[model samples]
Target: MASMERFLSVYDEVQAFLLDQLQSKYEIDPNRARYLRIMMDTTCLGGKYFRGMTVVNVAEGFLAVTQHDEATKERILHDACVGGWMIEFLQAHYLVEDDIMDGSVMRRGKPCWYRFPGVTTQCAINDGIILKSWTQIMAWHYFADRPFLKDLLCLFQKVDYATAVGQMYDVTSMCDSNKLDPEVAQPMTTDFAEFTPAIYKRIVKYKTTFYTYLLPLVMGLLVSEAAASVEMNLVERVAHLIGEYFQVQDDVMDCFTPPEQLGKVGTDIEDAKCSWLAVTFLGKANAAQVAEFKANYGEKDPAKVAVVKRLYSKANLQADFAAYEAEVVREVESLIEQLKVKSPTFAESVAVVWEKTHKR
Candidate 1:
């Protein structure tokens, strides 16, 4: 709780820092600065902040197991907080664009950043670009003089690139039309033949895993200068494993969980998203079931959506997902046990990630 509180307290400082930097840049245009302030609050504020917390938690784990002095520890923790905020900024950038691409409505109990009053699609596009720029700017502000600054910035770029490609895989896999233009649509249908297991894994690994799971752990390690102590290969392996597991959970939850619990309206069916559930259902469904899904899979109509949901029930996806979740927990635990011998701190870091998802 103490560590969580410490991490949460950094948000105000980070927000103020970005606002100051942005305002100074657009000093000639006070209205532009004002618009930015509103944009930042609307897009970035609110949410679970789970990814940022992961960074802080891992940094603290390293601190607990290492021999840093009091002052050094404080500096390390501060850097970790800054690193966490960068993750949030990167996340906000994606969510803004993602909401637009997915044609989503609410986010974090409010309208999506793109859906704000008077915010044109043109404005939202540039706003997402601005949000991503802040991550780079924030990194420079705090880590400018640090030896690892270049590496840290490059890591962000690499993750961002991978995630962008993943989004490409995600959006294009559903249909040939990359643009989700309502006017151009005759009908949106998922390309079932293209939604293979390999493609699904690629989408999960690059899109969600690299940014959500791998980057935070890597960011924390970099902040604490603990990367030297742990093998990067091993870290990537473990992070990818956890990321894939968590993403599968997300795909399932998108279908079954309440909109309030999900913090947004579920639209995997409507969006014709390439998801684990969709792939799993494809593998299990028969000819008639496949035909049923092909007809109703990506339609915006609630009745069509319900047909997809009913097919999910017919295949007993919830049971399969339950079994898959348990199996993954065991697999992840076994890997954590191996890390326990190599580095208890590293194992502790992963354990923190495990706890975040597996509430039970």
Candidate 2:
């Protein structure tokens, strides 16, 4: 099995390569180049790199079992890296826009990509679009001759559509007070409880899970020529579970983890993020807590923030979320055990899953 450290080194190298590609392809001078570099660096700086790592692990796993020649393995792994970077590029595309939407000041412990000095807010939106287009360009060029290239492109387009729909739903959910109310407050208002979880799951499935985990893993499987029967079903189940866990963990970490650790301020609360934690807290709060949350959960006041934190504490939100995390990990473990054939590739992929669940 590959160690996490080894995997990270590969991730870092690929990131650096992508950055270099951007610089060379753009042909910008030092000053303008610095701006693009900062945006790229900030966008890539943090997070678990789980999506990219999963691609490499899955691709390598399938190739190893076949014991393909060195050249074929290299080609497959190269494509895997390309696919992984494609995921990162999509994330950057979203974050650039998300920062503007959320009015975030900092990201990855530095100024938000859009907030970088001298970059107009409008330009930031264009930059996000450029980032996404660049990912597609890279994908087409790298995989152009492969037998499954068209299938790969189609999958990417479908995932992009799904992700955009998810984002649209998210923004709409946040803007509509009636829809967002239950996500923000408590005491089980009949309408609030009913609407919140369903929307929350929809947001996760479209926005976070499909593009981040499902698409990338499926791309790897396709590239490796894995049996569609076992690979498709298993990857879909594992990807959905892992993606759900990833987003929920992110929501919890936004509140509890330090900015240094999480790479951004806990803005979800202030931004009315419509996350699982918010909805779950609303579901679990009492009358007084609900009232307090209604007044302060999304308010800008420091005192209100403190009050909201207190409400979360009173509800034991973090502890319950931790328990949920444990349960998901157990479920994933059981699923892995049931797999009929445990190839090195499969084991490597499973190892990545375990690392994600166990990582801080």
Candidate 3:
């Protein structure tokens, strides 16, 4: 695929653009811009960019199927790479804020941007807003005259809104009006019952699936101008399934995988997260089991961790996860048939998009 070489070649150029715009267009004080510059590099630009690369590669795949010559492909490649970096930018923005919200101390090895020296939550909040504005700036500057530019912008806007709405629910309290109510839903909840599979579906769709998979894939198609004639709705239904599977794997690994391998300690249970393991265990357990399950889980105690881990083993989440993965892969395969992605030209990208995911 064209993604690796294409994205790396333009990587420096993307930073130059952001830096130049940071002062010239956005008009930040030179002093503040220096720190923000480092923050941008360390937090946003320094990841294993699975989503952004997917954008570039998938766009390349779509363009490859068309009648475009090498020169035309080159032009599309440059613009699509810009859009790819834009996806990275949005991800960085969310990470900046999410780290602070989830109280996540480390990401990809280093402290989160909010925890970086000379940075605070206030700066990170504004920094996230600044990064988001780049979406409009890049899209308008690069593709204003394209036939599908509005659709591209609209999709970005829609995903942004949906993500925020999902975050609202994620951080919500069961009794916002009266914080002193008998039962209050904290920003994070321990009650897996409160976050059912049905609501989990909605949260994953809006918060995870659409932005992480659907928007990136659809953005690539829209940029290539092929989406006008494509079967997007069906593919989106497929993105949802993969995304659901993607999130479950992430939650499972939090405890199942070691922290050194995972790059951080498992905080999902300690954070009172509503995760797949928690939900499934809660769903299957009887009332007697529920009380026992609820007694486990904690923030810092090793004993609490032991209880939760023992319960997880009792439930056999590994077998459960494997079964769920089979179901999602089957559903995805059926959709691929409808997609006619069997052709080798597009199949290369289909494989690339399929294998990797780091849904921040």
Candidate 4:
């Protein structure tokens, strides 16, 4: 908890640093600076901070097992904090863009950045670009003199591109809403052929897992100088499994959890996303269920959304989700046990991540 609180404090530091850069370094107008600040606040604040905290916790765990002077330890933790916020910034970049793509209204219990007054779709697109640029700029500003600067920048770039590719897949996998008439509401056209288990796993691994799980964990390893000590192959494998599990959990929660509790409205169904729920139900559904799903799956109407939810319940997706969750936990545990033999710190670091998700 002490570590978590300290990590939280880094948010203000990074925010102020970025804001200062806008005024002094970037030479932006005062009015435009306020726009960027609010853009950062609305999109980046109020989340669980899970990914950022993971970077810190993993680096801190590595520091525990390795020898480092007090000053060096503090420096490494500072690096981890900045790297964590980098991830958060990247997340904000994605969220602003994603909310636009999903046509989502609420985010983090308030209106999404694009939904705000005076910030329509066009300007929101620019905000997303700014967030992405700031991620690398902040990293370059902080780590330029460090030995691991190249590694950090490369990791950020690769993860950023990978996430964009995944987003492309996810967006293409969904129903086409690109109509000529903007005023007319287009009918939802969900295609089951696009929602395969293979495609679902591909989307989850690249789109969600690469950024959410692998990036943060690897960022910690790199910042702590522990990357060379651990098995990279196993590290990625574990990330793959955990990422798959996490997105599946998200798929379940989207339908089941209330908007008030979820902190945003769920739009997986409305967006016709290639989700675990859709793939799993399609795999097991009968002809009648298929007909029902086809008739009511991807429409924005509340009645249609309710029908899809009923189909999900009628298929008993919760049981399948529970079973899949348990199996993933077991696999990760076994992998971690193997990791302990080679690197106790590496095993210990990832185990903490698994424990948090396991509890959830």
Best by lDDT: 4
**Against the true structure, what is each candidate's TM-score?**
0.92, 0.83, 0.89, 0.92
- Looking at model 2, report the run of 10 residues with the lowest lDDT sum: 186-195
Better of 2 and 3 by TM-score: 3
Q: Give the lDDT of residue 7 in candidate 3.
A: 87
TM-score, candidate number 1 = 0.92
Residue pairs in clash, model 1: none
Which order, best to worst by TM-score?
4, 1, 3, 2
Give lDDT tens digits, candidate 2, residues 1-360: 353455455456654655676678867566765666666566764766767767787887787568788888878887777777788778889888977986888876778877767776877898898778867877777778988788888888888898889887776555644545545652323233433777788888788888887887787777787645264567668777878888888888888888898867787766666778778888877787667777886666778887877778778886888788789879787667655454445646765666765684
Candidate 3 Cα deviation (angstroms), residue 294 = 1.1
TM-score quality measure for candidate 4: 0.92
Write model 4 residue lDDT over 211-283, tens digit each, in one string.
9889999999889987777788888899889888888888888888998988777888877877899999999
Superposed model 1: Cα runs more than 4 Å off: 28-30, 176-191
What local distance difference test score does each model get?
A: 0.84, 0.73, 0.73, 0.85
Instruction: Tell me the lDDT of candidate 3.
Output: 0.73
Q: How far is candidate 3 from the true structure (C-alpha RMSD, Å)?
A: 3.3
Candidate 1: clashing residue pairs, number = 0
Candidate 3: residue 172 Cα off by (Å): 3.7
The 10 consecutive residues of candidate 4 with the worst lDDT sum are 173-182
